[PDB]
Amino acid sequence: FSSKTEWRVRAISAANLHLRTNHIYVSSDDIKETGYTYILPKNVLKKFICISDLRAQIAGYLYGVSPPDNPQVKEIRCIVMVPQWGTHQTVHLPGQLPQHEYLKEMEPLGWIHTQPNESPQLSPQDVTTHAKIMADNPSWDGEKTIIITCSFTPGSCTLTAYKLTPSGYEWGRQNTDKGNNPKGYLPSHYERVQMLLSDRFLGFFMVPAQSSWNYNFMGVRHDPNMKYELQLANPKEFYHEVHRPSHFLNFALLQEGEVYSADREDLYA
């Protein structure tokens, strides 16, 4: 990434990121119908779309539960965003989990990230990243945990959803080569899960206590296992001033620079 001019062309696109969210289309396709069916509150998709970036892979953990007396629907009432650094087509996060007061009564539903570009199938990196999250944390169960990828389509935002199959868990648990076409990647690993929008409920977002979610500026300030607290507050926009320090703290200017043009009108207050 150019970090200087592809920086700002991407940011001035990122100035418009809120026109995106009100044009949606969903993957309408074959449902096996005995797997869970996931409920999306349009608000968290509003915030997700707005704070993201047009290249950098940004992701979050989903939190929510099943309603009383009818488990087969899993309503997601929480989107957590984690410290990170993402690629343009894969997002890398710390292994260690969110846990917090409001995080008590929910389980992790899986995770959801963005995508500049489109293809009607799951990344081998997606299946394997999730299978390796599930390699460590059995809190993630096979028939429970999903991946939702949000392609930025021309005049629309599209969200394709998958769950892992046990054979996909197998290949991902195995995976060493994370390349764009690893040997042994095929349809045989992923399966698309039922998702739908619903205007009935407003949930909440989550953000680290001592950080914000976007370290994409700070790939050295990120770690494999580095731990974090949580709190209830808004994520900062991907290109926020706060995680934008060295461009704004690039300061080499002197006091004498005011000694010139020393007319000192205020005329006010």
Partner 1 sequence: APRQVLDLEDLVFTQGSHFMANKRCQLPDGSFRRQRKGYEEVHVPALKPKPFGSEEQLLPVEKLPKYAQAGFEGFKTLNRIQSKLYRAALETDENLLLCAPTGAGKTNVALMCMLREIGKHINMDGTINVDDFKIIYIAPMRSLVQEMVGSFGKRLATYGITVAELTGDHQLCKEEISATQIIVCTPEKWDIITRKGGERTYTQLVRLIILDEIHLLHDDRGPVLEALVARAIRNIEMTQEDVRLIGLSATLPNYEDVATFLRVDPAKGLFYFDNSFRPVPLEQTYVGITEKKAIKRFQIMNEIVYEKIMEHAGKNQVLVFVHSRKETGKTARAIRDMCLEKDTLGLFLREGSASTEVLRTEAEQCKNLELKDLLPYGFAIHHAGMTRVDRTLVEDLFADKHIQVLVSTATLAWGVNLPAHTVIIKGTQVYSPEKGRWTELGALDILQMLGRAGRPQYDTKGEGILITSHGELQYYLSLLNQQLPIESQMVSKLPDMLNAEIVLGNVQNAKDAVNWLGYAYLYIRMLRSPTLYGISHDDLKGDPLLDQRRLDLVHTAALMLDKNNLVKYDKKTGNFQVTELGRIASHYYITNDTVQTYNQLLKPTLSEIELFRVFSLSSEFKNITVREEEKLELQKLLERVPIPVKESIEEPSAKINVLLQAFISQLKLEGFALMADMVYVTQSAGRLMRAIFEIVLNRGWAQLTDKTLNLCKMIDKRMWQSMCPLRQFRKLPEEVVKKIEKKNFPFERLYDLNHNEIGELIRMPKMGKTIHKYVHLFPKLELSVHLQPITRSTLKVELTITPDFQWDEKVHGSSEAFWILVEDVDSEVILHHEYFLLKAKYAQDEHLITFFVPVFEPLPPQYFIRVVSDRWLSCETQLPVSFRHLILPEKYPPPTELLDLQPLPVSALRNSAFESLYQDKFPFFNPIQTQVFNTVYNSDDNVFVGAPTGSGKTICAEFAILRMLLQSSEGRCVYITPMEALAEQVYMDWYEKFQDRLNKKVVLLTGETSTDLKLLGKGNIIISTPEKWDILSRRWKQRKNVQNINLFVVDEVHLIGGENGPVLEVICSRMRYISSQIERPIRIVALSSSLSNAKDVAHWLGCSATSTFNFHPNVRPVPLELHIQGFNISHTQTRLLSMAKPVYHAITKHSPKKPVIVFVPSRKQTRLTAIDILTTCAADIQRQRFLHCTEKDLIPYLEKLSDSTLKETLLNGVGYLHEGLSPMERRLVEQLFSSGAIQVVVASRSLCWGMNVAAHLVIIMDTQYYNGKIHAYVDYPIYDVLQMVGHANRPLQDDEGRCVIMCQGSKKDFFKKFLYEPLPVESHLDHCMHDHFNAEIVTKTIENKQDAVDYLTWTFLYRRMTQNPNYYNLQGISHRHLSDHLSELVEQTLSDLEQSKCISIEDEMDVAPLNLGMIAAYYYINYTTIELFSMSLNAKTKVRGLIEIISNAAEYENIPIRHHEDNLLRQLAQKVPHKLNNPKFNDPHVKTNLLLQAHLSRMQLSAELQSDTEEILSKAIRLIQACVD
Query: Does the protein bind partner 1 through residue 201 (CB under 8 A)?
Result: yes
Which region, judged by CB under 8 A, interacts with partner 1, from 30-38, 129-137, 139-147, 208-216? 208-216
* 3-class secondary-structure state, position 9: helix
186 counts as binding partner 1 under rule CB under 8 A: no
- Complex with partner 1: residue 190 or 217, whichever CB lies closer: 217
Site string for partner 1, 67-86 (x = CB under 8 A): --------x-xx--------
Q: Are the C-beta atoms of 110 and 148 separated by less than 8 Å?
A: yes
- Residue with Cβ nearer partner 1 (196 or 233): 233
204 binds partner 1 (CB under 8 A): yes
Minimal distance in Å, beta carbon 193 to partner 1?
20
Which residues from 102-161 bind partner 1, rule CB under 8 A? 102, 104-106
d(CA 115, CA 148): 10
Q: How many residues bind partner 1 (CB under 8 A)?
A: 82
The residue (of 17 and 131) whose beta carbon lies closer to partner 1 is 17
Is residue 94 a contact residue for partner 1 (CB under 8 A)? Answer: no
44 touches partner 1 by CB under 8 A? yes
| Beta strands 156-164 and 190-191, pairing class | antiparallel
Among 32, 45, 116, 164, binds partner 1 (CB under 8 A): 45
**The two structure tokens encoding residue 235:** 């994520």
Please report, as a single letter, which amino acid is at residue 184: G
Q: Site residues for partner 1, window 209-228 (CB under 8 A)? A: 209-211, 217-218, 221
Instruction: Give the residue with the Cβ less far from partner 1, 120 or 257.
Output: 257
For residues 186 and 232, which CB has a smaller minimum distance to partner 1 in the complex?
232
Residue 210 CB, shortest distance to partner 1, in Å, is 3
> Which residues 233-252 are close enough to bind partner 1 by CB under 8 A?
233-234, 236-237, 239-251
